[PDB]
């Protein structure tokens, strides 16, 4: 529906939609921007991520409320409505994964773009895994793991240990291990090793980069406090 609007206008309206907290609009604008076919800048990648993170975040919150009501009940209404929200969530995840596959990832050659998209791919397979129950839950989990793992491999070779994208990737991969893969020990070990190697690299950073990295290290520490 965005084929007739300029790429630059879609980006400008995505920024406006974020200010207005209209995240469904924001996501549609950035989907249109991706479909122009050009690669995305650092700023533009973050707009894409923020838009869909908010959209799927509201759907995940609603799914958990409805799933909890459904488990307490065990008419068809609660199950039917949970299924509807679940189907809508899966469609959003499939849309994001389709954008990454057509063709953001294959054209991403720099470490910072490629790791960013692969982390995204792991995240949205993780969201699919949160609601998966059938014969494909194992394959969805492995799809998330494989995307995170490739991102991890690149980030360890190409980024410093304090790089915020590398830190956020490890944070979310650790959450994957703890919440999805039933591997809490792997989750704790990744979070600790990530935190400790970042701590040793902080001396290299400017005041602004120091603030960026320590913010995410605090999230790693928050999870370790909860997990140990």
């Amino acid at each position: 529906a965005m084929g007739s609007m300029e790429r630059a206008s879609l980006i400008q309206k995505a920024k406006l939609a974020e200010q207005a907290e209209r995240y469904e609009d924001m996501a549609a604008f950035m989907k249109g921007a991706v479909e122009k076919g050009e690669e995305l800048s650092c700023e533009e990648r973050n707009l894409l991520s923020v838009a869909y993170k908010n959209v799927v975040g509201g759907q995940r919150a609603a799914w958990r409320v409805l799933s909890s009501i459904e488990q307490k009940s065990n008419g068809p209404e609660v199950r039917e409505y949970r299924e509807k929200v679940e189907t809508e969530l899966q469609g959003v995840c499939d849309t994001v994964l389709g954008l990454l596959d057509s063709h953001l990832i294959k054209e991403a050659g720099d470490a910072e773009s490629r790791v960013f998209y692969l982390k995204m791919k792991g995240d949205y397979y993780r969201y699919l895994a949160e609601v998966a129950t059938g014969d494909d839950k194992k394959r969805i989990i492995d799809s998330a793991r494989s995307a995170y793992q490739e991102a991890m491999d690149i980030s360890k070779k190409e980024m410093p240990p304090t790089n915020p994208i590398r830190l956020g990737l490890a944070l979310n991969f650790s959450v994957f291990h703890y919440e999805i893969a039933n591997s809490p020990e792997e989750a704790i070990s990744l979070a600790k090793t990530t935190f400790d190697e970042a701590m040793a690299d902080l001396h290299t950073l400017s005041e602004d980069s120091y603030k960026d990295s320590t913010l995410i290290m605090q999230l790693l520490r928050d999870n370790l406090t909860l997990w140990t």
Binding site: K53, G57, G168, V175, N223
Partner: peptide
């Protein structure tokens, strides 16, 4: 546990 909040900017 918290993933990256990721909802601003």
């Amino acid at each position: 546990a918290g993933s990256i909040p990721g909802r601003r900017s």
